[PDB]
């Protein structure tokens, strides 16, 4: 969870709403196991 | 400075 | 590092680019909540946009720590601080900061 | 050899030449005495750049400019109590990762007419976190503190804050205004908890002591054109090796605007001041049932 | 060298001669394999008389007959998790004096018609003490236990209790009696807290497993003519180095009367059984907000 520790402070002339781009990764100690079929994307139709 | 840390006969 | 879709609220193709970033703006100074997401790379949610999430989809078990880089894309004159808190399992969604 | 070594300066590093016609050293004369800690030394000045290169305490990390503009209170890093200083015979618990970590208290808003606030320690951390549970459960408490006051403002904003650590910050009252009432401050004023308490008279710090002379105490500036944060690493100071965390505040963190906040219309009017504090080398002894106060 | 060392017996102390025509060791044959821990060894039998000479854990002392009639569970003293066994990268907190101490749960009354009770661990210590606060505040938990069941009765009283430690004591139901309901035990039955839960069918231990065969598990007898207490030092057993203390009970302490309590009229009819347990080498990791369950 990301919380406003103080605020988002801008002067006049700066936009009142900004954006944060979250980039996600894994460290050197990361390890995956037991390879399996993916289910993040599924197709109900054949490939023409 | 703390010193507390086959059966036989 | 791969873009994490924390703001996976929009669904239409016109605003699909809004999924890659989440807004930060001036608040009332009451420790407001900006964004939440689960820290599971293989879970169906924000992490599916990540290569860590996609590659985790091909493996049953994962272990190790995760890097989540939050990059601020406001102005140079935009200042502020954010508390990014990772809750270990057991603790629900925090009500306050 | 013929006199008791029982003066108030025994064990000190200074030899005192004195005159004594009696059995006790405290009967003797005052005699003769045969960077600077009080100037709020920095981490570079204290030689503690190795412990401040990246401030990660517990599972918490603050990102701030290190070393040069980071203040160690009284030139003393927080440390565990030695065997000589400690009197309690039970061995204290040292959680050190569940209680020694940055806690974010609140987000008090800085206004142009703002007077200032104070936070009493460890009363701020009495009822939250594993530190709060250990303070409630244990009679004896000893810890340093790493206070990281944060106030972000734009480059078109102005103002400075005196972020200072006032040890034994005893709160006084107006005494009815006329000074003939002998009033005492309430419990919510003396120990205001995590949300703090606003100063009624910041000039006298609600204690009859000038705000101008507060910089002898470990202090920092949040002059907005230069820095947006104030890191004061604060040791444990008391006349005692340990103390109760529920009815004694070792110090009070003063955050008052010496220079008022000002900005032109159009800039964000909500300038919040966020208080972050990490206990350092926490020590809890005398375990019993948990008590809120 | 030509095969992966990925069988289920890698890292064990026994060499297995096997036959493998494949790349993986787990594809190989079962092969050949090229006091007693399960007999509830005593402290004398375990060679741990130095740690049991007087049982003082934390600020708590139990006075009981040591060494000979004091049982170490599975011949294993509780110990902190090693680097090889541990997977969590954060360093856990080890309070060791605030959480490693004897807690006295309750004083369940033994009757002539009494069936027996079970206590689930560390569910018994979930909501009391600094151990309870650490278990609620931390996701990960690892500790041994020193259970000291106490039952005092006069020399004219008779009866014996099977004080036993049943690891992973999963509670079953009557399944509606007819066995065709697929009922599940409630939360207050599975995790009954400090006050425990009385056994409905002590013969099957409410789990379909006989009470007679419970002595393979670390067990003790409170045969009243011989001993009035049962000390079982219990290590941490899990498939995991750490686990949640709120939704997983590592073991269940069975205290049931195998021999019914009996005495003549005139003797005191209130024979209470007092449960005392000291966590040993407690380890809490994964700190977050406190959660009751």
XYZ file of C-alpha atoms in Angstrom:
740
model
C 0.000 0.000 0.000
C 1.188 3.501 -0.906
C 0.233 6.289 1.498
C 0.759 10.045 1.398
C 3.540 10.500 3.936
C 3.266 14.288 3.749
C 1.555 15.427 0.514
C 1.968 16.233 -3.172
C 3.238 19.824 -3.109
C 3.460 21.980 -6.243
C 3.699 25.746 -6.840
C 1.560 27.723 -9.275
C 2.228 26.676 -12.857
C 2.787 22.995 -12.061
C 0.082 20.367 -12.672
C -2.016 19.489 -9.631
C -2.110 15.766 -10.501
C 0.957 13.663 -11.288
C 1.444 9.967 -11.977
C 3.625 7.208 -10.542
C 4.804 4.367 -12.777
C 5.271 1.168 -10.785
C 7.957 -1.152 -12.153
C 7.986 -4.646 -10.660
C 10.754 -7.243 -10.705
C 12.439 -9.927 -8.618
C 15.769 -10.025 -6.812
C 18.769 -12.334 -7.214
C 17.375 -14.694 -4.556
C 14.256 -15.288 -6.666
C 13.598 -18.796 -7.973
C 10.643 -20.403 -9.762
C 9.763 -24.087 -9.557
C 7.517 -26.809 -10.999
C 6.893 -25.575 -14.537
C 3.218 -25.637 -15.503
C 0.851 -24.419 -18.196
C 0.055 -20.729 -17.861
C -3.435 -19.442 -17.096
C -2.872 -15.673 -17.249
C -4.195 -15.718 -20.827
C -6.620 -18.319 -22.189
C -8.035 -18.723 -25.694
C -11.476 -20.192 -26.363
C -10.909 -20.095 -30.142
C -8.520 -21.827 -32.517
C -5.767 -20.115 -34.510
C -6.780 -19.645 -38.149
C 30.687 -4.181 27.728
C 27.517 -6.161 28.439
C 28.525 -9.868 28.206
C 24.844 -10.899 28.017
C 24.410 -10.850 24.214
C 21.337 -60.348 19.671
C 20.564 -62.161 22.923
C 23.664 -63.157 24.896
C 24.464 -64.997 28.130
C 12.015 -4.314 -13.913
C 8.726 -4.297 -15.807
C 5.772 -1.902 -15.582
C 3.351 -2.966 -12.848
C -0.337 -2.293 -13.518
C -1.298 -1.091 -10.055
C -4.042 1.077 -11.582
C -5.796 -1.807 -13.307
C -9.147 -0.009 -13.061
C -9.751 1.046 -16.721
C -11.004 -1.572 -19.160
C -11.804 0.130 -22.478
C -9.102 0.312 -25.142
C -9.194 4.127 -25.162
C -7.971 4.297 -21.544
C -5.886 1.103 -21.495
C -2.713 3.219 -21.382
C -3.931 4.615 -18.043
C -3.323 1.177 -16.504
C 0.463 1.608 -16.572
C 0.472 4.513 -14.097
C -1.539 5.622 -11.095
C -2.350 9.199 -10.083
C -0.783 11.182 -7.268
C -2.145 14.612 -6.379
C -2.412 17.153 -3.585
C -4.492 15.872 -0.679
C -5.947 17.158 2.592
C -2.883 16.028 4.555
C -4.584 13.264 6.550
C -2.309 10.374 5.560
C -4.455 9.448 2.577
C -4.260 6.146 0.718
C -2.854 6.370 -2.809
C -2.875 2.804 -4.144
C -2.926 -0.790 -2.921
C -2.081 -4.064 -4.628
C -1.283 -7.623 -3.629
C 2.387 -8.576 -3.574
C 1.821 -11.968 -5.241
C 3.476 -12.051 -8.697
C 1.513 -15.110 -9.807
C -1.866 -13.851 -8.612
C -4.457 -12.735 -11.150
C -4.334 -8.965 -10.806
C -1.871 -6.075 -11.037
C 1.133 -8.373 -11.511
C -0.149 -9.978 -14.733
C 1.245 -7.016 -16.685
C 4.712 -7.852 -15.330
C 7.162 -10.265 -16.931
C 7.646 -11.552 -13.396
C 3.905 -12.203 -13.331
C 3.824 -13.770 -16.798
C 6.824 -16.015 -16.115
C 5.355 -16.838 -12.711
C 2.270 -18.050 -14.569
C 4.375 -20.831 -16.085
C 5.697 -22.065 -12.712
C 3.746 -23.443 -9.769
C 6.040 -22.379 -6.923
C 8.095 -19.221 -6.463
C 10.418 -18.001 -3.731
C 12.578 -14.960 -3.109
C 12.214 -11.235 -2.655
C 10.633 -8.828 -5.134
C 11.713 -5.387 -6.336
C 8.872 -2.934 -6.960
C 10.317 0.330 -8.269
C 7.981 3.319 -7.991
C 9.073 6.136 -10.301
C 7.613 9.625 -9.944
C 6.614 11.204 -13.252
C 5.546 14.625 -12.028
C 7.225 17.968 -12.473
C 10.641 18.906 -11.128
C 8.779 21.384 -8.895
C 6.577 18.587 -7.529
C 7.751 17.630 -4.037
C 6.403 15.232 -1.454
C 6.857 11.991 0.424
C 5.081 8.650 0.177
C 5.041 5.761 2.643
C 5.089 2.567 0.583
C 4.215 -0.194 3.049
C 4.420 -3.924 2.380
C 2.219 -5.800 4.835
C 3.350 -9.380 5.559
C 0.576 -12.006 5.373
C -2.092 -11.939 8.037
C -2.528 -8.200 8.186
C -5.541 -7.047 6.184
C -5.746 -3.865 4.127
C -4.666 -1.099 6.545
C -7.367 1.405 7.426
C -4.860 4.238 7.934
C -1.159 4.931 7.467
C 43.468 6.048 51.058
C 42.451 7.821 54.265
C 39.252 9.265 52.756
C 36.135 7.849 51.138
C 36.013 8.289 47.358
C 32.466 9.594 47.559
C 32.364 12.973 45.849
C 30.045 13.771 42.955
C 32.944 13.743 40.462
C 34.277 10.246 41.177
C 34.494 8.111 38.056
C 34.890 11.153 35.809
C 37.832 11.595 33.445
C 39.110 14.821 35.074
C 41.453 14.903 38.052
C 40.374 17.524 40.593
C 43.046 18.876 42.904
C 41.281 19.683 46.159
C 41.666 20.322 49.878
C 39.965 18.003 52.369
C 40.349 17.829 56.142
C 37.556 15.256 56.487
C 36.794 11.589 55.876
C 34.574 12.176 52.822
C 35.634 13.384 49.379
C 32.397 15.334 48.986
C 33.431 17.484 51.961
C 36.427 18.755 49.973
C 36.716 22.082 48.186
C 35.473 22.671 44.657
C 39.128 22.835 43.638
C 40.596 23.055 40.154
C 40.285 20.923 37.029
C 43.979 19.983 37.367
C 32.880 18.371 16.435
C 31.469 19.937 19.588
C 28.630 17.722 20.909
C 26.460 20.695 21.902
C 26.631 22.323 18.442
C 24.389 19.621 16.860
C 27.196 17.656 15.175
C 26.558 16.027 11.829
C 27.233 12.411 10.906
C 30.347 13.575 9.056
C 31.363 15.569 12.136
C 30.662 12.606 14.438
C 32.631 10.152 12.299
C 29.512 8.004 11.839
C 29.198 8.061 8.048
C 29.314 4.247 7.971
C 26.027 3.976 9.905
C 24.223 6.658 7.875
C 25.181 5.786 4.284
C 21.634 4.536 3.725
C 19.233 4.887 6.645
C 17.446 1.526 6.793
C 16.278 0.714 10.322
C 14.263 -2.471 10.677
C 12.001 -3.109 7.699
C 11.836 0.644 7.022
C 13.911 2.840 4.716
C 13.895 6.634 4.506
C 15.449 8.235 1.421
C 17.173 11.469 2.414
C 20.423 13.362 2.015
C 22.899 11.702 4.346
C 25.994 12.508 6.404
C 26.398 16.265 5.949
C 22.892 17.455 6.886
C 22.056 14.576 9.257
C 22.432 15.354 12.960
C 23.516 13.013 15.750
C 22.124 14.239 19.052
C 24.833 15.484 21.452
C 27.516 13.715 19.421
C 26.320 10.405 20.875
C 24.997 7.488 18.875
C 22.295 5.463 20.660
C 23.691 2.358 22.310
C 22.602 -0.465 24.562
C 23.030 0.105 28.283
C 26.367 -1.070 29.645
C 26.746 -3.290 32.698
C 28.110 -0.390 34.748
C 25.244 1.980 33.941
C 22.477 -0.614 34.242
C 21.063 -1.402 37.675
C 18.178 -3.751 36.843
C 19.325 -7.333 37.307
C 16.899 -8.962 34.853
C 18.145 -9.197 31.293
C 16.143 -6.870 29.021
C 14.614 -7.875 25.716
C 16.098 -6.350 22.555
C 13.690 -6.957 19.648
C 15.695 -4.588 17.408
C 13.774 -5.265 14.183
C 10.162 -5.178 15.340
C 10.621 -2.159 17.609
C 13.705 -0.515 16.019
C 12.135 0.774 12.808
C 10.702 3.974 11.369
C 7.148 4.703 12.521
C 5.175 7.379 10.672
C 3.058 9.284 13.182
C 0.874 11.867 11.456
C 0.776 14.560 8.797
C 0.233 17.880 10.606
C -0.524 20.681 8.154
C 1.781 23.703 8.042
C -0.102 26.978 7.572
C 1.016 30.572 7.163
C -0.352 31.327 10.654
C 0.839 28.031 12.155
C 2.437 28.208 15.604
C 4.162 24.832 15.909
C 3.758 21.414 17.514
C 5.591 19.196 19.971
C 5.789 15.418 20.263
C 6.802 13.695 23.498
C 8.953 10.581 23.316
C 8.333 7.673 23.670
C 4.772 8.770 24.452
C 4.242 9.107 20.692
C 5.017 5.389 20.278
C 3.250 4.211 23.439
C 0.130 2.695 21.849
C 1.240 1.547 18.395
C 3.571 -1.117 17.045
C 5.602 -3.828 18.716
C 7.484 -0.956 20.352
C 4.177 0.184 21.822
C 3.355 -3.319 23.034
C 6.808 -3.699 24.606
C 6.523 -0.287 26.275
C 3.104 -1.198 27.678
C 4.222 -4.670 28.779
C 7.576 -3.736 30.352
C 8.146 -1.417 33.294
C 11.641 -0.408 32.185
C 12.395 1.125 28.802
C 15.576 2.420 27.193
C 16.036 3.434 23.563
C 17.523 6.044 21.317
C 15.555 7.595 18.500
C 16.054 8.540 14.852
C 13.537 11.319 14.238
C 13.069 12.110 10.538
C 10.760 15.114 10.245
C 9.627 15.529 6.640
C 8.114 18.630 5.048
C 8.036 18.808 1.251
C 7.315 22.097 -0.487
C 7.963 23.442 -3.957
C 10.838 25.700 -4.973
C 8.400 28.643 -4.976
C 7.451 27.985 -1.341
C 9.364 29.581 1.517
C 9.693 29.077 5.254
C 11.910 27.341 7.788
C 11.129 25.005 10.670
C 13.144 24.565 13.850
C 13.094 20.797 14.243
C 14.646 20.428 17.690
C 14.878 17.758 20.379
C 14.208 19.243 23.811
C 15.168 16.803 26.591
C 12.782 16.739 29.561
C 10.406 19.188 27.866
C 8.244 20.048 30.863
C 5.062 21.831 29.794
C 4.011 24.892 31.755
C 0.729 26.778 31.671
C -0.377 30.392 31.441
C -1.168 30.133 35.192
C -4.524 31.749 34.493
C -2.830 34.510 32.496
C -2.301 36.689 35.567
C 0.212 34.177 36.938
C -1.682 33.606 40.206
C -3.452 30.275 39.675
C -0.850 27.443 39.987
C -2.517 25.571 37.144
C -0.992 22.397 35.742
C -1.188 21.108 32.167
C -3.572 18.201 31.533
C -2.527 14.676 30.653
C -3.405 15.188 26.968
C -1.103 18.227 26.907
C 1.843 16.657 28.733
C 1.674 13.332 26.849
C -0.221 14.069 23.627
C 0.526 10.758 21.919
C 1.225 10.263 18.237
C -0.923 13.171 17.035
C 1.087 15.670 19.088
C 0.007 18.992 20.534
C 0.025 22.491 19.057
C 2.033 25.134 20.890
C -0.134 27.844 22.428
C 2.828 30.204 22.978
C 5.716 29.013 20.781
C 7.871 31.983 21.839
C 8.206 30.569 25.363
C 7.616 26.971 24.141
C 4.733 26.793 26.663
C 7.474 26.377 29.280
C 8.901 29.853 29.928
C 12.080 29.096 27.947
C 12.789 31.044 24.730
C 12.444 29.375 21.350
C 15.521 31.341 20.242
C 17.827 29.439 22.615
C 16.489 26.018 21.573
C 19.434 25.337 19.244
C 21.763 24.239 22.059
C 19.581 21.139 22.076
C 19.935 18.746 19.093
C 18.194 20.703 16.361
C 17.671 20.870 12.615
C 16.322 23.282 10.018
C 13.772 22.520 7.293
C 14.467 25.719 5.387
C 12.433 24.793 2.334
C 14.816 26.269 -0.246
C 17.609 23.956 0.966
C 16.221 20.790 2.593
C 12.784 19.192 2.873
C 13.661 16.836 5.735
C 15.350 16.855 9.137
C 17.034 13.706 10.456
C 18.079 13.902 14.108
C 19.577 10.707 15.507
C 18.819 11.049 19.209
C 20.486 8.966 21.952
C 18.852 7.908 25.193
C 19.357 10.611 27.821
C 18.202 10.146 31.394
C 19.592 10.286 34.890
C 18.670 6.579 34.909
C 19.778 3.627 32.757
C 16.109 2.748 32.157
C 12.780 4.441 32.783
C 9.058 3.964 32.400
C 7.855 4.686 28.873
C 4.320 5.549 30.044
C 4.870 8.280 32.658
C 8.209 9.823 31.659
C 9.031 11.496 28.354
C 12.789 11.582 27.796
C 12.564 14.423 25.284
C 10.108 16.492 23.304
C 10.448 17.068 19.565
C 9.730 20.723 18.796
C 8.712 21.457 15.199
C 7.788 25.145 14.976
C 7.993 27.591 12.040
C 10.571 30.241 12.857
C 10.079 31.633 9.352
C 6.392 31.558 8.358
C 5.283 29.493 5.393
C 4.455 31.702 2.422
C 3.606 31.119 -1.232
C 1.689 32.852 -3.983
C -1.901 31.940 -4.794
C -2.061 28.969 -7.143
C 0.546 26.873 -5.380
C -0.673 23.993 -3.237
C -1.865 25.391 0.124
C -1.631 22.008 1.881
C 1.959 21.778 3.110
C 2.065 18.838 5.544
C 4.767 18.023 8.067
C 5.208 14.280 8.531
C 6.953 12.944 11.637
C 8.937 9.717 11.276
C 10.892 8.236 14.175
C 12.902 5.040 14.500
C 13.810 3.786 17.985
C 17.474 2.823 18.144
C 18.916 0.135 20.443
C 15.642 -0.390 22.279
C 15.788 -2.119 25.656
C 12.731 -3.267 27.623
C 12.990 -4.699 31.141
C 10.646 -5.469 34.009
C 7.994 -7.491 32.219
C 4.473 -7.624 33.671
C 0.940 -7.265 32.331
C 0.392 -4.620 29.674
C -0.654 -1.189 30.941
C -1.803 1.658 28.706
C -0.487 4.257 31.160
C 27.731 -36.111 -12.219
C 25.533 -37.064 -15.174
C 22.294 -36.865 -13.158
C 20.504 -34.197 -11.153
C 20.745 -34.667 -7.382
C 17.018 -34.116 -7.011
C 15.571 -37.099 -5.179
C 13.606 -36.804 -1.947
C 16.499 -38.254 0.089
C 19.215 -35.790 -0.945
C 20.880 -34.135 2.028
C 20.105 -37.081 4.306
C 22.792 -38.960 6.226
C 22.123 -42.341 4.549
C 23.677 -43.417 1.264
C 21.119 -45.111 -0.990
C 22.451 -47.485 -3.617
C 20.058 -47.230 -6.544
C 19.541 -47.835 -10.253
C 18.805 -44.895 -12.552
C 18.667 -44.784 -16.344
C 17.420 -41.180 -16.372
C 18.597 -37.618 -15.793
C 16.842 -37.191 -12.426
C 17.692 -38.886 -9.134
C 14.014 -39.072 -8.196
C 13.449 -41.341 -11.208
C 15.732 -43.960 -9.636
C 14.660 -47.086 -7.787
C 13.820 -47.144 -4.094
C 17.061 -49.068 -3.618
C 18.741 -50.091 -0.381
C 19.946 -48.188 2.673
C 23.546 -49.109 1.760
C 17.770 -43.190 24.021
C 15.338 -43.775 21.171
C 13.738 -40.427 20.199
C 10.294 -41.967 19.649
C 10.176 -43.609 23.104
C 9.752 -40.226 24.896
C 13.369 -39.900 26.075
C 14.085 -38.292 29.415
C 16.528 -35.471 30.093
C 18.944 -38.047 31.507
C 18.422 -40.167 28.389
C 18.888 -37.144 26.105
C 22.079 -36.007 27.837
C 20.466 -32.651 28.670
C 20.724 -32.694 32.465
C 22.654 -29.401 32.381
C 19.649 -27.525 30.943
C 17.106 -29.098 33.316
C 18.879 -28.922 36.691
C 16.482 -26.155 37.718
C 13.805 -25.211 35.198
C 13.835 -21.401 35.188
C 12.691 -19.999 31.842
C 12.410 -16.228 31.668
C 11.191 -14.701 34.920
C 9.359 -17.944 35.754
C 10.451 -20.948 37.810
C 8.660 -24.281 38.163
C 9.697 -26.544 41.044
C 9.505 -30.169 39.930
C 11.479 -33.396 39.918
C 14.074 -33.029 37.187
C 16.070 -35.135 34.728
C 14.696 -38.644 35.260
C 10.953 -37.984 34.894
C 11.251 -34.968 32.565
C 10.662 -35.691 28.879
C 12.308 -34.047 25.874
C 10.031 -34.337 22.860
C 11.433 -36.631 20.137
C 14.900 -36.432 21.683
C 15.227 -32.900 20.298
C 15.764 -29.782 22.360
C 14.125 -26.649 20.917
C 16.571 -24.525 18.965
C 16.642 -21.442 16.792
C 16.194 -22.007 13.073
C 19.446 -22.514 11.192
C 20.385 -20.630 8.036
C 19.882 -23.751 5.917
C 16.387 -24.497 7.226
C 15.182 -20.889 7.237
C 13.827 -19.394 4.022
C 12.567 -15.986 5.181
C 15.200 -13.370 4.420
C 14.234 -10.875 7.140
C 15.949 -11.396 10.467
C 13.439 -12.571 13.094
C 13.079 -11.084 16.548
C 14.102 -13.249 19.512
C 12.732 -11.678 22.717
C 13.671 -14.797 24.725
C 12.802 -13.408 28.169
C 9.459 -11.721 27.560
C 8.085 -14.506 25.362
C 10.209 -17.479 26.543
C 8.706 -17.984 29.996
C 6.150 -20.166 31.749
C 2.553 -19.069 31.160
C -0.160 -20.549 33.378
C -3.272 -21.120 31.279
C -6.142 -22.412 33.404
C -7.120 -24.832 36.147
C -9.438 -27.421 34.563
C -11.069 -29.613 37.203
C -10.494 -33.370 37.088
C -13.618 -35.367 37.953
C -14.301 -39.072 38.327
C -16.360 -38.953 35.107
C -13.978 -36.569 33.324
C -13.183 -37.356 29.686
C -10.125 -35.202 29.005
C -9.082 -31.946 27.349
C -6.797 -30.779 24.569
C -4.869 -27.544 24.109
C -3.646 -26.392 20.699
C -0.270 -24.688 20.445
C 0.526 -21.824 20.077
C -3.198 -21.063 19.869
C -3.266 -21.247 23.676
C -0.761 -18.366 23.832
C -2.196 -16.370 20.923
C -3.945 -13.612 22.896
C -1.928 -13.262 26.104
C 1.560 -12.084 26.996
C 4.367 -10.608 24.943
C 4.390 -13.965 23.158
C 0.764 -13.335 22.234
C 1.542 -9.821 21.025
C 4.486 -11.074 18.949
C 2.367 -13.873 17.469
C -0.369 -11.391 16.551
C 2.093 -8.832 15.168
C 4.324 -11.193 13.156
C 3.281 -13.390 10.251
C 5.993 -15.984 10.872
C 6.413 -17.816 14.162
C 8.790 -20.530 15.333
C 9.239 -21.775 18.892
C 9.614 -24.861 20.991
C 7.583 -25.391 24.123
C 8.102 -26.596 27.691
C 4.686 -27.861 28.772
C 4.448 -28.472 32.527
C 1.058 -30.021 33.269
C 0.408 -29.981 37.014
C -2.147 -32.044 38.926
C -1.742 -32.305 42.698
C -3.679 -34.916 44.645
C -3.247 -36.537 48.030
C -1.682 -39.928 48.697
C -5.197 -41.351 49.169
C -6.240 -40.184 45.690
C -5.763 -42.392 42.644
C -5.787 -41.966 38.883
C -3.410 -41.402 35.987
C -3.397 -38.869 33.165
C -1.909 -39.324 29.710
C -0.215 -35.976 29.188
C 0.800 -36.262 25.538
C 1.878 -33.926 22.746
C 0.085 -34.782 19.508
C 1.671 -32.992 16.528
C -0.804 -31.688 13.940
C -3.780 -32.770 16.057
C -6.505 -32.383 13.444
C -9.956 -32.473 15.036
C -12.614 -34.587 13.367
C -16.345 -34.684 14.003
C -18.992 -37.340 14.529
C -20.105 -36.595 10.927
C -23.682 -36.441 12.172
C -23.235 -39.749 14.001
C -24.267 -41.800 10.969
C -21.093 -40.739 9.151
C -22.943 -39.213 6.177
C -22.812 -35.462 6.838
C -19.253 -34.204 6.040
C -19.387 -31.871 9.025
C -16.348 -29.863 10.067
C -15.378 -28.771 13.582
C -15.966 -25.105 14.450
C -13.251 -22.540 15.034
C -13.715 -22.709 18.824
C -13.158 -26.478 18.661
C -10.125 -26.434 16.364
C -8.410 -23.503 18.126
C -9.930 -23.369 21.617
C -7.454 -20.881 23.071
C -6.071 -20.917 26.589
C -9.141 -22.493 28.202
C -8.891 -25.569 25.971
C -11.623 -27.918 24.825
C -13.058 -31.055 26.414
C -12.846 -34.266 24.406
C -16.242 -35.556 23.306
C -14.880 -39.019 22.415
C -11.486 -39.431 24.118
C -11.189 -43.028 22.866
C -10.743 -41.813 19.281
C -9.360 -38.417 20.441
C -12.144 -36.792 18.365
C -9.956 -37.635 15.360
C -10.470 -41.344 14.640
C -7.063 -42.268 16.102
C -6.903 -44.437 19.251
C -5.911 -42.934 22.580
C -4.017 -46.168 23.297
C -1.460 -45.508 20.540
C -0.837 -41.904 21.639
C 2.383 -42.797 23.482
C 4.511 -42.837 20.316
C 4.094 -39.073 20.504
C 5.980 -37.251 23.310
C 3.939 -38.243 26.340
C 3.957 -38.281 30.126
C 2.020 -39.855 32.982
C 0.574 -38.073 36.022
C -0.068 -41.285 37.924
C -0.941 -39.617 41.206
C 0.801 -42.146 43.461
C 4.145 -41.400 41.765
C 4.211 -37.896 40.243
C 1.953 -34.844 40.411
C 3.415 -33.085 37.365
C 4.370 -33.779 33.755
C 7.136 -31.766 32.085
C 7.412 -32.299 28.329
C 10.027 -30.154 26.606
C 8.663 -29.954 23.071
C 10.697 -28.816 20.037
C 9.309 -26.986 17.034
C 8.072 -29.503 14.464
C 6.767 -28.410 11.084
C 7.391 -29.064 7.429
C 8.355 -25.368 7.408
C 11.039 -23.383 9.261
C 8.365 -20.886 10.360
C 4.581 -20.763 10.295
C 1.639 -18.585 11.202
C 0.770 -18.779 14.892
C -2.877 -17.808 14.287
C -4.086 -20.371 11.725
C -1.780 -23.355 12.279
C -1.379 -25.340 15.488
C 1.920 -27.227 15.490
C 0.740 -29.710 18.113
C -2.083 -30.431 20.509
C -1.514 -31.239 24.176
C -3.765 -34.136 25.178
C -4.468 -34.431 28.911
C -6.993 -37.239 29.406
C -7.550 -39.595 32.369
C -6.698 -43.121 31.283
C -7.272 -44.241 34.871
C -10.286 -42.455 36.393
C -9.828 -40.224 39.410
C -11.162 -41.882 42.550
C -11.083 -41.101 46.266
C -13.166 -41.814 49.331
C -15.724 -39.332 50.626
C -14.101 -36.735 52.860
C -11.102 -36.070 50.656
C -11.102 -32.879 48.608
C -13.295 -33.413 45.515
C -11.738 -30.486 43.616
C -8.697 -31.949 41.865
C -7.563 -29.326 39.333
C -5.204 -29.803 36.412
C -3.105 -26.707 35.748
C -1.413 -26.249 32.371
C 1.898 -24.374 32.315
C 3.872 -23.895 29.107
C 7.089 -22.033 28.370
C 7.962 -21.234 24.745
C 11.573 -22.128 24.014
C 13.766 -20.367 21.428
C 10.908 -18.277 20.075
C 11.362 -16.701 16.651
C 8.970 -14.163 15.113
C 9.360 -12.896 11.544
C 7.274 -10.995 9.025
C 6.202 -8.023 11.108
C 2.999 -6.173 10.185
C -0.037 -4.856 12.043
C -1.383 -7.018 14.848
C -4.110 -9.486 13.879
C -6.134 -11.523 16.363
C -6.592 -14.340 13.842
